[PDB]
Amino acid sequence: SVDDFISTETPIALNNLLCNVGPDGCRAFGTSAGAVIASPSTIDPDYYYMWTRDSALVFKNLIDRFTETYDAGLQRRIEQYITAQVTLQGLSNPSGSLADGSGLGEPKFELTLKPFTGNWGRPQRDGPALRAIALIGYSKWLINNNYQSTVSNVIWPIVRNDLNYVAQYWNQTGFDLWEEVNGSSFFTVANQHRALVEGATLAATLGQSGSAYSSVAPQVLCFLQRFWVSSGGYVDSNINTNEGRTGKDVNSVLTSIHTFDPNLGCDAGTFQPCSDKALSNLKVVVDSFRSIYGVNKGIPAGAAVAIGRYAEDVYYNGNPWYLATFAAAEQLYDAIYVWKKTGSITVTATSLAFFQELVPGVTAGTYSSSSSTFTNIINAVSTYADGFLSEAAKYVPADGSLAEQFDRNSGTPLSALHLTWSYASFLTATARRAGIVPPSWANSSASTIPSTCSGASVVGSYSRPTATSFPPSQTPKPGVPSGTPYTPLPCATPTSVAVTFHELVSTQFGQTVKVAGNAAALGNWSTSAAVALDAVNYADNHPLWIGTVNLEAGDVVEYKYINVGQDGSVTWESDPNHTYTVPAVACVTQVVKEDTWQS
Ligand SMILES: *[C@@H]1O[C@H](CO)[C@@H](O[C@@H]2O[C@H](CO)[C@@H](O)[C@H](O)[C@H]2NC(C)=O)[C@H](O)[C@H]1NC(C)=O
Ligand SMILES: *[C@@H]1O[C@H](CO)[C@@H](O)[C@H](O)[C@H]1NC(C)=O
Ligand SMILES: *[C@H]1O[C@H](CO)[C@@H](O)[C@H](O)[C@@H]1O
Ligand SMILES: *[C@H]1O[C@H](CO)[C@@H](O)[C@H](O)[C@@H]1O
Ligand SMILES: *[C@H]1O[C@H](CO)[C@@H](O)[C@H](O)[C@@H]1O
Ligand SMILES: *[C@H]1O[C@H](CO)[C@@H](O)[C@H](O)[C@@H]1O
Ligand SMILES: *[C@H]1O[C@H](CO)[C@@H](O)[C@H](O)[C@@H]1O
Ligand SMILES: *[C@H]1O[C@H](CO)[C@@H](O)[C@H](O)[C@@H]1O
Ligand SMILES: *[C@H]1O[C@H](CO)[C@@H](O)[C@H](O)[C@@H]1O
Ligand SMILES: *[C@H]1O[C@H](CO)[C@@H](O)[C@H](O)[C@@H]1O
């Protein structure tokens, strides 16, 4: 049963999610405190970086969990994530610097919390919005528990930079959440709108300046309306671009679930999950995958299918994604929640096709909780939503691991292993199924659309946050649900650890980088026995060499990189030797050591 899968997968998903959080997660061990790896995959693909988006989506989930039941272990991680942003905001990077806010649009960073210097689809203007939303989430908790001073001193300067960025740069093109399309993107705009609304509210509570945010927000909402295609009944996910796609993209479904607020009911203006526009869009998006994936062969209309990002996708050949398939279920669980709470379901001309696929012959109208129609709809939609979970479940391996994708024909996992966002997406979908909803972000007025739109923006001011520490033991006030600290799943302690040496060093044609060191596996300082690294991930402006050696757990190793020429001549990097103690920690079987050539 679905219930069986949920009960089994939940502790695995939570464990695997937290394994990807530094400095102590089992697959992110030795990364910076508060860093989140997108995936431990370092080769084909190389996802061993911290993205602003993935990190913020993951921590929003954790903050929501933590808000439901206090967990001092989660609190520790949340605090470290927040303080890591102090370092990141200050960075000058290829998108720009903090001075004019432009640097905040940078999509990804090295896990040492240094800039990523390679070519990339930058900027991505959703990042600051999503980060603000996460930090505002935690701020709400602190305020409710009488720690408002901590918000003002530690969190608000960080949040204020991100909010100023949104208010200044929302009306500018950039890359979408898939990092491919330079334009105006639904997910980005909608989250920018939410960030400004929550920001204005938090500012008012703190007695800080928020009027810029509240005056810009309605204009962002105004622009969001332009993504709707009335003739097709779906959202064109990217506009102001010439990419030549239909625009039918799980982008829009993710948008609905990440800006869900049940207090907004079935508001179509903000694209709520039970809104007629969101329901119509869901059907159009799902339908775009029904006929194209081998895994969907033989599944009838009215039944759940595996879905991907967008039908035109050619990334790894274009496949279903776990997070996309879970997102469809989540939107439906969100819809069911609101229908049950309000005791009423409205079918309109816009959502009719969606409903008739599930309840043949139903017509437009309003059906109350006493009607047989209400019960019929609830059951049909619940079954369909569970169907998306069960479809994804067919392709989850016995160990419960979630990669990024599963093959469109065979269902075998592919691309990045242990994608942090895949685990978050399972956790959120299943929370909504159980009727666990996140804190509200809007009031009724946050849905009122202006008469005429303009690209109104405000030039902001940016300053480096300086506070990098939280007061100890910020426990909940009496009466708040409270529990014991999180403990990871148990494993054996390994005797051997795969150590991936990950070295940035600019080299010229015919040169090879090797690692030499005192351990037998490293060649006991012999240059002939040194371990050659690979240039598989090498680029001139991101000169990465990589390779993996098994070392004895607990061993203290000393090493240096060498550059070996065509002629066999050896160049040692400058002193001192690197000194590394190989971890001997239960569950830590592979680590990445991120080095830069010592000049
Ligand atoms: C900046 O904001 C303006 C105002 O919302 C956007 O202008 C609209 O663009 C859409 C799509 O091209 C048109 O359908 C509307 O007619 C435009 N309205 C006006 C008043 O010009 C503009 O697209 C935004 N640009 C970016 C990059 O965000
Ligand atoms: C390492 O090599 C040196 C030669 O420089 C030698 O003295 C020593 O015996 C070697 N150690 C091991 C572990 O074999
Ligand atoms: C963040 O950094 C500051 C110094 O800039 C420390 O005071 C603090 O304890 C934390 O390490
Ligand atoms: C504050 O107090 C808590 C106990 O509630 C400790 O666990 C913590 O180390 C800090 O001293
Ligand atoms: C949480 O509990 C701690 C005790 O560890 C108090 O210090 C704090 O005021 C809050 O009630
Ligand atoms: C709430 O209560 C739990 C145990 O009941 C503690 O573990 C937690 O630190 C908080 O005080
Ligand atoms: C293997 O050994 C380590 C010792 O550091 C333990 O921490 C672990 O629980 C396992 O027994
Ligand atoms: C790493 O650091 C240690 C410090 O004990 C040195 O002994 C070693 O040579 C390397 O620099
Ligand atoms: C790794 O950690 C061990 C234990 O602290 C040290 O002995 C070694 O020098 C390295 O720092
Ligand atoms: C080392 O091995 C463990 C299982 O033994 C994995 O969980 C880990 O990802 C690494 O490959």
- In the chain, the N- to C-terminal Cα span, in Å, equals 59
Measured CA distances, 428 to 92, 213, 259, 409 (Å):
34, 28, 13, 27
Give residue 83's identity as a one-letter amino acid code: T
Structure tokens at 338: 């609101």
Closest C-alpha among 256, 326, 245 to residue 288: 245
Show the CA angle centred on residue 283, arms to residues 282 and 288, nearest 5°.
Answer: 100
Residues 512 and 487: their CA atoms lie apart, in Å, by 43
* Residues in contact with 85: Cβ distance below 8 Å, sequence separation at least 6, in sequence order: 34, 131, 135, 158, 465
Residues in the ligand 6 pocket, defined by CB under 6 Å: 70, 72, 475-476, 482-484
The 3-state DSSP class for residue 391 equals helix
For residue 525, give the ligand nearest its CA.
2
Domain(s) labelled CATH 2.60.40.10 in the chain stretch across 486-599
Dmax (CA) of the chain: 85
In the β-sheet with 238-239, what is the strand arrangement from edge to edge? 174-175, 182-185, 238-239
- What tokens does 369 get? 């909780």
**Mind spelling out the 3-state secondary structure of 35-81?**
CECCCCCCCCCCCCCEEHHHHHHHHHHHHHHHHHCECHHHHHHHHHH
Ligand 1 pocket check for 95: Cβ under 6 Å: no
| C-beta of residue 305 within 8 angstroms of C-beta of residue 290 | yes
Pairing of strands 590-596, 496-504: parallel
Distance CA 94, CA 107 (A): 10
State the Cα–Cα distance between residues 283 and 270, nearest whole angstrom. 18
At 194 the three-state DSSP class reads helix
Residue with the smallest CA separation from ligand 8 atom 7 is 579
Residue with tokens 């179509």: 268
Give me the helices (H) in 207-261, please.
Answer: 211-224, 251-258
- Ligand 7: atom nearest CA of 586 is 8
Those residues with Cβ within 8 angstroms of residue 220's Cβ, 6 or more apart along the chain or in another chain: 170, 189, 192, 193, 196
Which residue's structure tokens are 């908790």?
Answer: 141
Ligand lying nearest the CA atom of residue 75: 6
- For the domain spanning 486-599, the CATH number is 2.60.40.10
Tell me which residue has tokens 């993209």: 249
Is the CB of 451 inside a 6 Å radius of any atom of ligand 5? no
Can you tell me which atom of ligand 4 is nearest the CA of 72? 7
Q: Which residues contact 81 (CB under 8 A, 6 or more apart)?
A: 21, 34, 36, 55, 59, 134
Can you tell me the distance from the alpha carbon of 494 to that of 588, in angstroms, rounded to the nearest whole number?
A: 7
Q: How far is the CA of 482 from the centre of ligand 6 (A)?
A: 5
Query: Given the CA of residue 580, which atom of ligand 8 is nearest to it?
Result: 1
Ligand 2 centroid to Cα of residue 524, in Å, is 6
**Pocket residue to mutate for ligand 8, from 555, 558, 581, most atoms within 8 A of Cβ:** 558
| Alpha-carbon distance values, 131 to 137, 424, 507 (Å) | 10, 16, 36
Q: Where in the chain is the domain with CATH 1.50.10.10?
A: 1-485
Distance between CA atoms of 590 and 459, rounded to whole angstroms?
Answer: 46
User: Considering only CA atoms, which residue is closest to atom 7 of ligand 6?
Assistant: 484
SS3 label, residue 424: helix
535 class by beta-carbon count within 10 Å (0-12 exposed, 13-18 middle, 19+ buried): middle
Residue with tokens 């003739």: 231
Method by which this entry was solved: X-ray
- Residue 582 in tokens: 């190989």
- For residue 131 and ligand 10, the question of a CB distance below 6 A is answered with no
Ligand 4 centroid distance, CA of 473 (Å): 5
Q: How many CB atoms lie within 10 A of CB 72?
A: 16
d(CA 478, CA 120): 48
Here the tokens at position 457 are: 């923006």
Contact 146 CB / ligand 5 (< 6 Å)? no
What's the rounded Cα separation, in Å, for the pair 162 and 136? 11
- Measuring CA to CA, which residue among 430, 590, 424, 329 is closest to residue 55? 424
CB 43 within 8 A of CB 536: yes
CA of 476 to the centre of ligand 5 (A): 7
Angle between helices 52-68 and 72-90 (to 10 degrees): 150
* 105: Cα within 13 Å, side-chain hemisphere: 29
Residue type, 318: G
| Residue nearest atom 2 of ligand 4, based on CA coordinates | 473
CA 471–ligand 5 middle distance (angstroms): 12
Token pair 């901590």 is at which residue?
A: 150
Distance from C-alpha of 272 to C-alpha of 278, rounded to nearest angstrom? 6
- CA-closest residue to ligand 10 atom 6: 589
d(CA 41, CA 496): 19
Nearest ligand to the C-alpha atom of residue 69: 6
Q: Which of 232, 233, 230, 227 is nearest to 255 (CA)?
A: 227
Task: Report the SS3 class of residue 124.
Answer: coil
* Packed helices 156-169 and 126-144: angle between N→C axes, nearest 10 degrees: 140
Q: In sequence order, what are the residues at sequence separation of 6 or more whose Cβ sits closer than 8 angstroms to the Cβ of residue 468? A: 83, 86
Task: Specify the ligand 5 atom closest to the Cα of 476.
Answer: 1
Structure-token match 């592979």, residue found: 590
* Ligand 1 pocket mutation pick from 172, 224, 226 by most atoms within 8 angstroms of CB: 226
Ligand 8 touching residue 180 (CB < 6 A): no
Residues sharing a CB contact under 8 Å with residue 29, sequence separation 6 or more, in sequence order: 22, 23, 583, 585, 588, 591
CB atoms within 10 A of CB 204: 14
CA atoms within 13 A on the CB side of 592: 29
Contact residues for 311 (Cβ-Cβ < 8 A; gap 6+): 246, 248, 288, 289, 292, 318
* Residues in contact with ligand 7 (CB, 6 Å cut-off): 493, 584, 586
343 Ramachandran zone, left/alpha/beta (phi>0; psi -120 to 50): left
3 state DSSP class of 151: helix
Measured CA to CA, the distance from residue 560 to residue 515 in angstroms comes to: 6
Q: How many CB atoms lie within 10 A of CB 445?
A: 10
Burial of residue 356 (CB within 10 Å: 0-12, 13-18, 19+) is middle
| 556 Cα nearest atom in ligand 9 | 8
Distance CA 18, CA 488 (A): 8
- Best mutation site among 153, 468, 470 for ligand 3 pocket (most ligand atoms within 8 Å of CB): 468
| Cα(27)–Cα(415) distance, integer angstroms | 17
Q: Is the CB of 473 under 6 A from ligand 5?
A: yes
Residue whose CB lies within 8 A of the most ligand 5 atoms, among 142, 144, 473, for a mutation test: 473
Distance CA 419, CA 11 (A): 16
**Both tokens assigned to 15:** 């464990």
Q: Which helix (H) or strand (E) holds 377?
A: helix 372-393
Q: What share of the chain is helix, strand, coil (3-state, %, to 5)?
A: 40, 15, 45
Q: Given CA atoms 259, 265, 266, 270 in this order, what sign does their dihedral have?
A: negative
Contacts of 191 (CB under 8 A, 6+ apart): 126, 129, 130, 133, 255, 258, 259
- Structure tokens, 419: 């994608």
Fold designation for 1-485: Glycosyltransferase (1.50.10)
- Distance between CA atoms of 186 and 226, rounded to whole angstroms? 10
At 365 the three-state DSSP class reads strand
Whole-angstrom distance, CA of residue 517 vs CA of residue 507: 21
Distance CA 400, CA 457 (A): 46
Q: Would you call the peptide bond into 157 cis, given omega within 30 degrees of 0 as the criterion?
A: no
Please, which residues have CB within 8 angstroms of residue 535's CB and are 6 or more apart in sequence?
A: 507, 513, 545
Resolution (in Å) of the shown entry?
1.9
**Four-CA torsion 234, 240, 242, 248, nearest 10 degrees:** -20
Which ligand 1 atom sits nearest the alpha carbon of residue 172? 27
Q: Which atom of ligand 8 is nearest to the CA of 576?
A: 11
Ligand 7 binding pocket mutation candidate from 24, 29, 493 (most atoms within 8 A of CB):
493
**Which residue type occupies 204?**
A
DSSP string computed for 545-573: EEEEEEEETT-EEEEEEEEE-TT--EEEP
Peptide linkage before 107 cis (omega within 30 of 0): no
Structure tokens at 31: 């990364």
577 dihedral zone (left: phi>0; alpha: psi -120 to 50; beta): beta
Phi, then psi, of 395 in degrees rounded to 5: -115, 20
Name residue 144's amino acid.
N
d(CA 138, CA 526): 52
Both tokens assigned to 67: 């808000």
Contacts of 312 (CB under 8 A, 6+ apart): 245, 246, 318
Q: Which of 417, 293, 273, 259 has the alpha carbon at shortest distance from 333? A: 273
- Around ligand 3, the residues with Cβ closer than 6 Å are 468-469
Interval between CA 30 and ligand 9 midpoint (Å): 13
Which ligand number lies closest to the CA of residue 84? 3
**Active centre residues (catalytic):** 176, 179
Q: Decide: helix, strand or coil at residue 161.
A: helix
Whether 590 is in the pocket of ligand 10, judged by its Cβ within 6 Å, is: yes
Alpha carbon nearest to ligand 9 atom 3, residue: 581
Q: Which atom of ligand 4 is nearest to the CA of 475?
A: 5
